[PDB]
Each structure stands twice: as C-alpha cells, then as structure tokens.
Subunit: 159 residues, 8 copies
C-alpha cells in the first residue's frame, strides 16, 4: 500500500503528460504517489522530497519537467535511488530543450531519460516497473503479461 | 561472481566510450559481462542475447550505440529487463543522431538513456548500481560511500592558476 | 499477382503516411503487400518477415516508422533485398528523429532513405518502381508514362 | 565490362568520400564508371549525363554532393533510373546541409539517401549491388557471401586492452 | 512593359508565399513575370528559362521553393543574372531544409538568400528593386518613398 | 573590499571559461569572490551559498555551467538577487545543451543568459558591472571609460596583409 | 512616477509576448514606459532612444524582437545601462533564430537573455526588478513577497 | 577607380573569411573599399557609413559578421542600396548563429545572404559583380568569361589516385 514509486512534476501543466506514467503504474498495480515539486519555484520542497525518498520506502523516482528541465537532475543530486526523467514537450522548442536539459547529465549523477512527451511518461513507468520486477515475482509476472499483450495485440495490417 | 549486468556495444570502436561503464561496475564490485553485439550485423546474436538475458541471471543491460543507434532499443524489444542506453558520439553529428535514435523509443518499449559519450557510459553504470542497490544492502552501502565521497571531493574554489 | 514489394510500418499511426506508398504502387499496377510490423513491439515477427522476404518472392521492401525509427534498419539487417526507409513525421521533433534514426545507417547494412512524411512514402514507391523497371519492360513503360505525365502536368503559372 | 552503375560527384574534394563506393563496387565485381559532374558548374553536362544514362546501359546512379547538395536530385530529375544520394560532409555544418538538401526531395522525384560520409558511400554501393542482385544470380551469390562474411566477422567481445 | 524581373516557383503550393514578392513588385510598378518552374519535375523548362533569361531582357530572377529547394541554385547555374532565393516554409522542418538547400551554395555560383517564408518573398522583391534602382532614377525615387513610408509608419507604442 | 559579485562554476574545467569573468571584474575594480559549487555533486552547498548570498552582501551572481547546465537556474531558485548565467561549451554539442539548459527558465525564476563560452563570461562580468554602476558613480565612470575605449580602439580597416 | 525601466519591442506583433513584461512591472509597481522601436525599420529612433536612456533616468532596458532579433544588441551598443533581451517566438523557427540572434553577443557588449516567448518576457521584468531591488528597499520587499507567494502557491499534487 | 562596392566586417578576425570577397572583386577589376565597422562597438560609425554609402558612389555593400551577426542587417536599415551578407563561421555553433542572425531579416529590410564562410564571401563578390554587370557591358563580358572558364575548368573524372 505504501508507495514504492514517486512521480513528481514541475507544474500542473506537466500533468497532461505525466498522467500517462500514473495510469501505467496503476494498471500494473504498483503503489505510488503523484506530486508537483518544482526545482525552480519550490527548491526546498524538492531537497526534502529527494533527501527523504529512500527513508520513506520509495524505490524509484519518475520526474518530468519542460524547458530548462532541471527537476530530474536535481532530484538525483539528493537521492541514491534511480531517477528516471521525462522531457515534457515545450511550446517553442518541442521538448528539445527539455530533452537536453535532462539527458546531458555530467558523469557522477545519473538520470535515465525517456522520450519527449506522453511516450516518455509511459515508458518511465514501464522502466520503473521493470526495475521493481527484479525483486517482486508477482509484479514481474504482471509485467510479462503486459509486454506479451502489447506484442500480441499489434495488428497484422492497417485499417 | 556470475554477471548481473551486461554491457554490450555494436563494435570495437564503441569500447573507448563503454570502457567507462565497465570500470565503474568493477569499482563498485558489480559482477558483469562485456560483449560486442551488432544489431545490424548480428541481428540473430542480439535476438538470442536479449531473449535469454533474464534466464541467464542478468538484471540490467547497458547498451552503447552510435549513429542509427539501434542496439539499446532492439535489445529492449526482446528482454523484460530494464535496458539503459548510451549514445556513442558520432563523427559528423556528434552523437545527436545516436541520442535521438535511442531516447525516442515509442511508448511500450523503454530505454533509460544517458548522456552522449563517456559521461553517459559512467552514468549508465551508476544508474545500474542504484537499481541493484535496491535489493543488495552491501552494494547500497558501497554506492552510498561512493556518492558521499564524490560530494566531499568537490573543491571549494578553482585553481585560478 | 504475387507481391514483389512489401510495405511494412511500425503501427497503425504510420498508415496516414504509408498509404501514399500503397496508392502509388497500385497506380503503377505493382503487386504488393501492406503490413504492420513493429521492430520494438513485434521483433520476432520482423525477423521472420525480413528473413523470408526473398524466398517469398519480394524484390523490394519499403519500411516506414517514426521516432526511434529502427524498422528499416533492422529489416535490412535480416534481408539481402534493397530496403527503402520512410521517416514518419513525429509529433515533437517533426521527423528529425525519424530521419536520423533511418538514414545514419553504419556502413555494411544500407537503407535507401526518402523524405520525411507523405512525400517520402510516395517516393519510396516510385524508387521501388524504378528498381523493378530495370527487369520489367511493361512496368518500365508505365513508369516512363507516369514521369512524363508528372512533368507535362506542371502548370506554367500559378492560379 | 560495360558500366551498369555510374558514380558521379561534384568535385575532386568529394572523391575522399566517394572512393568508398568505387572500392565496394569493384570488390563485388560490378562494372562501373566514376566521373565528376557539377550540378552548378556544369549543368548541361549533368543534363546530358542524366538523360542518356539509361540508353548507355546504366542501371543505377550513385551521386555524391556537399552543401547545397543538388547533384543527386537534379540527376534524378532527368533519369528514370533509381538514383542513390550520398551526403558529403561539409566543413561548417558537418553534412547536415548536404543531408537535408538531398533527402528532402518532393514527392515525384526520388533519391534513395544514405548516411553522411564514407559510410553512406559504402552503403550506396551496397544498396546498388542489392538492386542489381535482383536480376543477376552470380552477383546475388557474391553479395550473399559478402553479407554472410560481415556477420561472421563480428567479434564476440571487445579488446578490453 | 517588358518584364525586368522573373519570379519563378517550384509549384502552386509555393504561391501562398511567393505572391508577396509579386505584390511588392507590382506596388513599386516593376514589370515582371510570375511563373511555375520546377527544377525536379520540369528540368528542361528550367534550363531554357534560365539560359534565355538575359536575352529576354530580365535583370533579376527571384526563385522560391521548399524542401530540397534546389531551384534558385540550378537557375543560377544557367544564368549570369543575379538570382535571389526564397526558402519556402516546409511542413515538417519549417523551412530549415529549404534555407540550407538554398543558402549553402558552393563558391562559384551565388544565390542571394532571403528569410524563410513570406518575409523572404517580400524582401527578395525589395532587394530586386534596390538592384534595379541603381540604374533607374524613377524607380529609385519610388523605392526611397517606400522605405521612408515604412520607417515613418511604425507606431511609437503598441495597441 | 568585501565581495559584491559572486562567480561560481560547477568544476575546475569551467575555469578556463569563467576566468574571463574574473579578469574583467578585477579590471573594473569590482570586489568579488570566485568559487566552485556543483549543483549536482554539492546540492546542499549550493543551497546554502544561494540562500545567504544577499545577507553576505553579494549584489550579483554569475554562474557558469556546462551540459545539463543547472547551476545558474538552481542558484536563482534560492536567491532574490539577479543571477547571470554563462553557458560553458560542451564537447559534443558545443554548448547548445548548456545554452538551452540555462536560458529556457520558466516564467518566475530568471537567469540573464550570455553567449556560449569566453565571450559570455566576459559579458556576464560587463553586465554585472552595468548593474552595479547604477548605484556606484565611481564604477559608472570606470565603465563609461571602458566602453568609450573599446569603441575608440576599433580599427578603421583590416590588415589586408 | 518617472520610468526607471523601458520596454521596447520591434513591432506590434511582439506585443502579445512583451505585454507579460509590462504586466509584471505594473504588478510590482515599477514605473516604466512601453514602446515600439525597430532596429531595422526605425534605426535612428533606436539610436536616439538608447543614447539618451540613461540621461532620461532609465535604469534597465528590456528589449524584445523576433527573427534576426538585433534589437537588444543594438540598444546595448548605444547605452551603458543593462539591456535584457527577450527572444520572441518566430513563425517558422520557433524563436531559435530569435534566441541565437540575441544571446550570442560578442564580448564587449552584453545582453542578458531570457527564455523564448512569454516566460522570457515575464522573467526580463522580474530580472529588471531584482536589479532595481538592489537600491530600492521598498521594491525589494515587494519582490520578496512576490517570490514568496510564487513558491507558496505551487500545489502539492496535480488536479 | 572610385569604389562601387563596399566590403565591411566587424573585426580583424573576419578578414580571413572576407578576404575572399576582396580578392574576387579585384580579379574582376571592380573598384572597392574594404573597412572594419563594428555594429556593436562602433554603432555611430556604422550609421554614418551606411547613410552616406549611396551619396559616396557605392552601389553594393557586402557585410560579413559572426555570432549575433548584426552588421549586414543594421547596415541595410540605413541604406537604400542592396546589402549582401556573409555569415562568418563561429567557434561553437559553426556559423549557424551567424547565418540565422543575418538571413532571417523581417519583411521590409532585405539582406541577400550567402553561404557560411569563405564560399559565401566569394559568392557575395560574384553576386555583387552580377548586379554591376547589369549596367556595365565591360564587366558583364569579364563575368561571362569568368563563368565560362569556371565551367570549362571542371574535370571529367576524379584523380582516383
């Protein structure tokens, strides 16, 4: 029941994208928390969140933000837990700024980066699941079923 | 000492970059294997490697690739394990083609992508360690000590010559 | 009657683009098959499709996909037949990711790449036709007529 | 030994890149011609070369070009034969201008485009071979052997020094 | 009455952009012709047009095209007259492909390139006018008036 | 001689670029401090540095950073003082990743960004000086003289060899 | 009552973006002027504006423009005052041209650059405020309140 | 021998690129002047240079600039003469910043832009010549001969070593 994955985002405007990560974790029945934590507007909230994540039982953190998307990187700076980053599509640069601001982390503090947008949000959740599956047999089976259904469901020809 | 992490790359030319992932895993005492698997030249080798990764005991796969960097993505298509991708810098486009070809995976098949080049390789190994640390207390302690040391080793001022 | 060209695409979402390749081949009366084969979601389906293409009588394969568009490249990895790639326009990066993921193939395994989007889908079909025309006199004549009509139909002044 | 493939480039500076296409065609025993045709400096030469390519027996044209890489596209405008384009790396933009100027052909006039640089030149020749192999059993066998050898020659592990 | 400026474009789809060049030349009363000439679809039409431009009395050629926009460059290849290029905004790459395909002309054959889109079409016409003004006193005066009105008309504060 | 400007950078490797900011401030007789603060390796050091900047007497902060250049932005999140950011050129992407990661701050937390590299560092210092000049007549005069000299020092023609 | 900040923009079309800078300064009660000054269409107006800015009592200039956005740079060329630049989002290149045309100022003449678009306009105003706050205690307090409210107002979870 | 073309650049560092424009004008016997005018460091010098260009007899202005390449555009704002812009390659962004900062002029103030670097400088001079050739028969003949020679000088095949 206690969250094992924390989904954080820079603002309400990132929800349209991050809701896909939330839906996926719920689909696979992975207990999680979904919050808004801004590295730029609420820096101390982020420091505390990231600093205490492990103690609180979190195993993986999924962070999404757009523009100068420093959220994933700063979260990883305070936690030893794996941090996965989702580049949110920005209005002008279509997430290219978001992507580079997240993936180009200097050696020493990693952030596993996913694709720009909804696909990336969904994949961060799936990646977090594949991580949890390493030590949770039941979930591992559900993840296998999920991947198997994805594969079997692809049509043979277009409509 | 059975490998729990698998480092794969498309060619010998990728080693200059991927060696940083290898070095870090060894530093943290993480048993691993290092191989060359070409998505384009040895597709069936990749298929077999990826399909059996889990049954062979691997927990995380770190794949490096340049240009139409397909290795990480194709590996993830066959394994349920988490796959981390390292974009190898390319001659003309400086790794931008490698980066986009790896990170832009469609929803459903993830690849945790790291920075272009050496930094990315080192971080892929660090990310892999943080994943394994979740269920390995001894490793978790070693990683904690490693992160703590990194922070304490940062100088307070530059050597202004 | 047996297909000599195979048109494959990563998903239904690529159809809006790949239908242009289908229409062109039909226009020139080139027998072909149009299927959905995902390198990421249905890897074994792709391996089998590409591996057996030649045996089945296919002469050219046209593959379209977007984002990390590895479909054309992986298809070429398993077949000796010429593979033509169509970069599908992606939501965020407008097909720049699709283009680079397809054209930047390392030496040893080629993929003839066409333009991003519908133009590219149409041109892949035309290129496949120009290839088949080398050993099919009847088709060669129809292709000549097609190119001649294209040229003669261009207006002299804008409306 | 009449040429069945024509390799053309805009200038001598392109040879460093296009020589890889030449080498591969020769390796596979594919009769071909190699010439310099400037779309911008010798437009009429290009017009004549492209118009008569088919009647001269050519089956495939491989054109290399840099910067406002117009050669492949203009050649295709005049010939019904399949034209393959090789983006030659440029000084400032590293071939991105060459790539976009070649691959972005409007619907109706195709140019099968390969990777920027040497890899693209080699692949243009390989693609040309796969095209000719469709109606040349002997060549098809040589290409099959070449691909098979490439796959078998990939090492299983890197020389970790 | 005889045209001194020729406006050519790759296709009807470029008209929405090139009409701005036409309107400007008409505004300044510069006799001109507006045609569709495709370097890819009507290469011989282009060769003849460019080759005979000077003989026909043309002083400047304004060429617009999108994508692999080779039109301006190829026109300049056949004429000694100044050729001005207008990069038409493409669907996917927003004219970045059009711009690079036009401006990056190798030394030896120039093309004066203007901005992507309508602004570029308008400026090609203005540039062509500034060229003609060097030997046409009446036009030079009208161009001076045009530039003076542009400058004087800019509001002092936004509405 | 208490510092009124603080120059911070993520690592020693940034010094080659940031030294230009230091040199200019000294040239204009602007008391300042120069330190290394890593946003990613020493997050708490940055938090403390930024929070107390104003109470310590600092008026302007100049932060340099490369790659996922987070330093300028994170510093601004904690201080009410104006923060100027210098994008440090990166190996692969030539500072484009540094630039976008710094300039694209969301509304609400500003970072006055300068050009990539040495020019940006020099200009960050010049911008800082123009800010301080607003309430320091002596400095305003020195800056005026500096700008005037720059303009008067431009040659009228190139040394055409 | 006399303006201490001058907001200038290349044209009326930049107002949709620059109005955000105007609103912010008004919110913090910072006396300012909002004008249209084009570096390309009204160069002498710009020279005079920038040249006399300091004499007129202005402390900071916020300049916004799109495309070949040389406005901030040229304004800084004539004034010793700090100039902040706002890259306006352009139609084709989404402000990438605007951004590079402003931020890449050679050493010797600075322009503090903000993000592309509305965010950048808002931040230029906030940056200008943080500058004025250094010598205006009352404003400094209002700026502290503004930043504090921004931070406290961020929701804890998405709706 | 009064100048009819004016070549201006922002600094001595631009000369390496702009010298190609100078050389070509001289080759074609086109009287011209070559000066350094900084848009950012000597704004009033530029204002005066541009305003009086026409009255001084100049017919075409060729301006080179790098980075926030403002020179060509600002010059055009003050002169009714046609202005040609040469993007000078920049260190980090390889002239892309120079290119966009010059070519993207808003409707109403044109700048005929050439390629990034040396090729652009040479072509700016060639374009200037083609403009002057419209009302100078002698020059028109020299340009015709120059173009004809260029075409005739292109080799038919590469030196395949």
């Amino acid at each position: 029941s206690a969250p094992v994955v924390g989904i954080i985002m820079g603002s309400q405007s990132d929800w349209e994208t991050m809701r896909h990560a939330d839906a996926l974790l719920t689909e696979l029945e992975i207990p999680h928390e979904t919050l808004i934590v801004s590295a730029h507007r609420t820096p101390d909230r982020l420091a505390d969140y990231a600093r205490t994540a492990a103690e609180r039982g979190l195993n993986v953190i999924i962070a999404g933000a757009g523009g100068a998307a420093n959220l994933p990187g700063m979260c990883a700076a305070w936690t030893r837990l794996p941090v996965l980053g989702v580049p949110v599509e920005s209005r002008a640069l279509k997430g290219m700024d978001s992507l580079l601001s997240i993936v180009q982390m200097p050696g020493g503090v990693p952030v596993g980066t996913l694709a720009i947008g909804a696909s990336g949000a969904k994949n961060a959740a799936l990646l977090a699941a594949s991580i949890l599956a390493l030590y949770n047999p039941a979930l591992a089976a559900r993840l296998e079923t999920w991947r198997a259904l994805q594969t079997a469901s692809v049509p043979n020809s277009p409509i």
